[model samples]
Target chain A: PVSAEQQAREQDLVERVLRSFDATADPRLKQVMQALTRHLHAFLREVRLTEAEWETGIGFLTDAGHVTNERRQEFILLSDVLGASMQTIAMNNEAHGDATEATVFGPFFVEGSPRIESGGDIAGGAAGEPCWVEGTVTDTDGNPVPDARIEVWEADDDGFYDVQYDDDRTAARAHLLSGPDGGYAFWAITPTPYPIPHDGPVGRMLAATGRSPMRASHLHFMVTAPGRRTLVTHIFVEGDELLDRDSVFGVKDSLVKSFERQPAPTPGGEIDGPWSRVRFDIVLAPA
Target chain B: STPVSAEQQAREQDLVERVLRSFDATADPRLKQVMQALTRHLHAFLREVRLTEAEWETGIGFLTDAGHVTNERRQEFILLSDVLGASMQTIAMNNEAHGDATEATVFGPFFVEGSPRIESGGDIAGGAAGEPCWVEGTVTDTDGNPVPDARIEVWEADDDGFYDVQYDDDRTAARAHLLSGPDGGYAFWAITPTPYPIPHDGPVGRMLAATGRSPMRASHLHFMVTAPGRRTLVTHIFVEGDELLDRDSVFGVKDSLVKSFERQPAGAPTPGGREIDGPWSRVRFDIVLAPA
Candidate 1:
């Protein structure tokens, strides 16, 4: 059979390919590339992949690139679907104790969200019940880390981010600097569980695999402070049915919290009527 | 401290298993199997490398660039596979020799459909300047039975190592066709083989340069032989003494496919009563087809 000789040559080719990265100027590049070559070659041999299959893979990648633009990152979504992005997140974002666990920095995270006052609402008049989110940032040793930069963003009640609204709108996103005591608060609409954008190749892949494209309803947070490790995480709504089945595999028990509905006025008197309150405390690791 | 904690490792493993199982419902059994295998390999690679976010982003950017540079004129992805030796491997597996048949190699990107058919000994070089080369061959089965009506498609680069496809003026050179007669004999005139470098200005080219590997392919001629009931053979014949024979950029060369091209005097009377006006060459190749 031709299998044995081809497999041996395949092994040799892998080694040669790996050695080709020996002179990479950057150590990290060299390491990652060599590893990639081995895995890629190994995958080919293991599957005894057909030419048609290889072409299909190439076309999938090309389609991913074609669908990706400033507002959409189909490649990232592909990685997420393959669990590569989450694996990368798990490997790189290691935190301890009360320090918030990290999650995938989804494609929707945009740079330069509008800064808001401590009590300002990020919903920007979008249709959803008012929610008051307050949080305190402290070091692992229980001391306050004042002046922490807190970035918050989330989907609207209709399960769409501000960027998705084709009407040139930016809402449900804000940035705030913690006060002297490392406390920050903001008013935004409660996030609603929603399916990820499924109109593209990634969506097609999910449908083919019989997997849902829904992610658990959650708010995104990125907290950073001087001499502290930056945290990129999410606070999942407790009791959400999708918490145990986040399509992207981004849920961690430590990150879920209660989004208590309050019948009376908000604690700070920022709004009148039935509202929601969620307190999320963040701990930072030393950088 | 270990960068990856025990809890983190557990979580990572759980996620990997979840992701792999998520594809169980793929309607196509083959697709499900491939996806699972791909997921395993992809995740394993990441774990082995402990890739950082920046490095992952760099990979994303590289792929995006490759896709951006690909078009009708060029195929960077195929080139990527070629340089990686994936294409060659696929060719070898798919075209394994059966009986005493000739081995197969890559059907390079330059082959065009509907090439002009020519009679025996007709020149395919068409206005291109190169040493006139007589290539005669017979198509037969392993048992030496003649395979008549077999289509012989031949294409090659000019002496300058440039294919007609590279020109923008719609000039087709060094590529034409013929059919084997009742005796399964075929012949055509083409440019003598010349070693040439594969395109080296793209991502695949960049990869070759970075890997300290040359992008040169040995001098060769491309042939695609097809008949009604026999397996179609897409292969190349290399010049026996070409220096780049062992290091072909695409690894498409096989020792069994190498042959000598004897240089002949200008006045030599070749087959079909064709008289050469200058220095010419002659090569004889016998091809055996496997059962379909």
Candidate 2:
């Protein structure tokens, strides 16, 4: 149903658009732009687009951009909902023997979290049940990696991250170093399942598409050591009902761990109150 | 060896599937279809390109800039679509015909409603500077039946290639006006059309320049004709021999729409039987509408 001349014209348009990237000195930029042109034109031809539909798509993008700001990144949220972010993370972080399986580095992460002692509490002033987290870091060969940096963060029981609240405060987050024995431990609030921030275009999209925004209860972790690849992942709470249906599609079987309840005055007499404890060992691949 | 790890490939597949299934509950059937198609195409594009995070951020920034530059008077997004030829594709699909009919083209951004009315063959110049030209046309059905009392609205840029909307002139130049008489015939005096650049101070314009394209549109007159029981026709007739005719910025040209604008010497009889001054021009365009 297409003419030869029209076909040639379409092909020419694609070529010209691709060639426009010639001025882009960055090889990566040129590659990206050329591929984008091909796919964009292909999309237009496949849909046999209508003007009204085109307007609708443009309007959606414009609204998405307008809704985005410094604190709120609607574009990234859109990418997440579209599965682009997860796919990118998955592609970039391949499994290396026993190394941790990586997932999305969600938008909530903050830099320079306060460093704490190995047994210090990260859930300072956060309202939630106490949980003790301990883990050991090792290389792929199973050798101990002492003094490895371990960063941990999670939402409180109320399903709110420290940044979500209006008050300018920080809690439920800390950085610690593995001890001489390659083991690290810290006290923090139990991981809580929470809905992703969804009050913008992405939220409207979810509502329109009839999708939930709830993520599985999980603790965010990042372990890194010199001369080794860094690992950024999540440890899901085993048996959590949302594990099978994380809204962000970030859950992985290898990342799930059990959080066991313990009686008061538990082992080693280090605690005077009842608390839950979970251990997640990390395996780093060569850098 | 595969550049993509088995785990990575597995995760990509799982995410695409989950995202596709997530929209199954969309209340609107059409929305569901569109969303699914959008998801598939978007994922395929990302996979084909193996798009990187830095490029994704650049795209976001481009979209934000396009949005920020859009206002009541300017539609940068539409311009982007036009430059990409997406608008033309849509126009062609929607305006297709099974029989002989006036070929439709883009309605450029300058069209404004509520132009001042003038009598047949009356001057719509409003003191705009240009050589006078008489535009005459007949409106008819594809069956060659005249559409009596059909409304033909015509507008065009002056010799300066700027619409009234682009200027602070007190009068509305190049705006729609009604046809005269009961024979589906219309005539009006206007400034001779001239090629002009589409607004080029924005991002879409920058894209055109970067892509080795000119933003100039061929000289043409815009028309919108309508009648009871007949399809409304939105189209344009280009000035034959115009250099830009073959490369109209928005791809709004057609072989059938190109017509000769015959120039005459001073004191020659005009098409409307009015004459007197310097050189003048005249052109005829007949519009054929399809079934409604």
Candidate 3:
């Protein structure tokens, strides 16, 4: 026999979770959890999700958990591959028009980059085309924000960041502070666009479709000032074929810029080969 | 609401209690844990939310549909795993693989067998080539020494970005198996990794799309490495530049593994006698095995 009473109760539980999710004590966390719940439930209904499928989903998830090792975080990889990391970054970091918008922080930010003085190059002896990166830090209003902590990282010209490599030997990826005038300068190899790993389950899924796993070539930058909203963004090399459609949907116009080849010699400029230059600023929103 | 006959209410309560009692006695540890958890939560939810029989039927119907949507090509269950953190969460809890060695993730319904022989350092990217990438790495104990004769089974997307296994084109071409060298060195050539959407033509894709979610996964390579004394490693090597590195839908990214795809100017011949074009990508991942 059909029971109206039971149906209303299920609705009530859903409502309670949704309401409590937003009204939780921690607003930021609440916002995220609530959004997560909404989509999660919506997903269930859309698929007409099943009890057996639910169980199998549970089993697969359990396997995902079971299969994880310290060297491998299958779940984290799953989340990263899914673009949840990008969403989290977007939600946490909203850059003002003045600065570059942060792309997802990614799963490899194991430790904060070792702090370095100004003009220090994070890319140490790594092989690739040379590039000079310079940027300023400012509040959302455009005034210079001095001595702000600016963290910078990028894959080598070949798309390998230090985290992906063997160890800290290269230290090609590092952190430095903006000068007293809010200017931060560094030298590193230009980052090349590369594809995601395609040997795992995620890879097979891609091959089943006609999609390519390549991301556009870009530089990763994180700008943080005492009173400003930190911005994490990619300074994408202009004309990157993937600009219109970053594999993970990470491209933003403000985040795209030309990494121009420099003609004249300047401090920290590339020595012999053609070098790229990009000028941008970070604007942190008020906390 | 129709006033429930007192007898019906009591009968329903009895039924709920009986199911709850049976769940408490489940034999499978994982299943028991799951049932106990589910029963408690579901029953409490029913009571707290005052769920009616009609609503329960709807929930059942939805679940039935989830089952109905499944066919050989796709799985609604895995979609459920993608949505609920369950797949990732459970994998993390059970896998002993450390983050520094390699990372693991979900195995979708398509990991069927029968792959061509890819010699050590061979190209396994198949003919559906994209940017050719050289993936060479070593398998060793946590101390970093290579383990000889280790087998590293791998698979990835073609240049057009599709798995050889996903095709129902009647070629159930196997995408499995590669034996590591005596020095624990493993290498292969694959198409440059690219983000591709999860199959949306099926129930999983539609659900993901309806929610404004993209099913694209960051490009990555999967491996199942095993040695005589070492525990088998089921893991992935992530492309550092993938935009979705931080947003894997199944929570499969690990901070330790984000690797780079070093550009190798194409000059060397393909390892497995596979002919490939110039400017291939190269990735090297050293695995650290847990103590036996």
TM-score of chain A of each: 0.88, 0.87, 0.76
Q: What lDDT is reached at residue B289 by model 1?
A: 96
lDDT of 1 by residue, B72-145 (tens): 76777788788777787777667778678998888777898888899887889997778888899899997789
In candidate 2 chain A, what residue range of length 10 has the lowest lDDT sum?
A264-273
Q: Is the docking of candidate 3 incorrect, acceptable, medium or high quality?
A: incorrect
Which parts of model 2 have CA positions greater than 4 angstroms off? A1-34, A44-48, A94-99, A139-146, A180-182, A222-232, A262-274, A285-287, B155-161, B168-171, B245-247, B262-268, B273-279
Question: Residues B96-185, candidate 3, lDDT per residue (tens digit)?
Answer: 364345655566555655666667755564556477676777777776777887777777666455787666575522255777788787
Docking class of 2: acceptable
Model 3 CA deviation exceeding 4 Å by range: A1-287, B1-19, B24-33, B44-58, B98-100, B171-176, B264-278
C-alpha RMSD (angstroms) for model 3:
27.8
Choose the strongest candidate by lDDT.
1
**What digit string (tens of lDDT, one per residue) describes model 2 on residues A1-287?**
87776667566656655654576555665666576667667776666666677777877777776775666777777887888777677666666888888777787788989899988889877888788888789989999899998888888889877888999789888899998878888888778888887887778888888888899998998888999888888999989988767777788788999999887554334545668999888899899
**What TM-score would each prediction reach against the true structure?**
0.92, 0.86, 0.47
- Candidate 1 residue B122 Cα shift, in angstroms, is 1.8
Higher-scoring candidate on DockQ, 1 or 3: 1
lDDT tens per residue, model 2, B169-267: 557776657764667677888777889888888877766665557888889888888788877788888998999876777777778899999888888
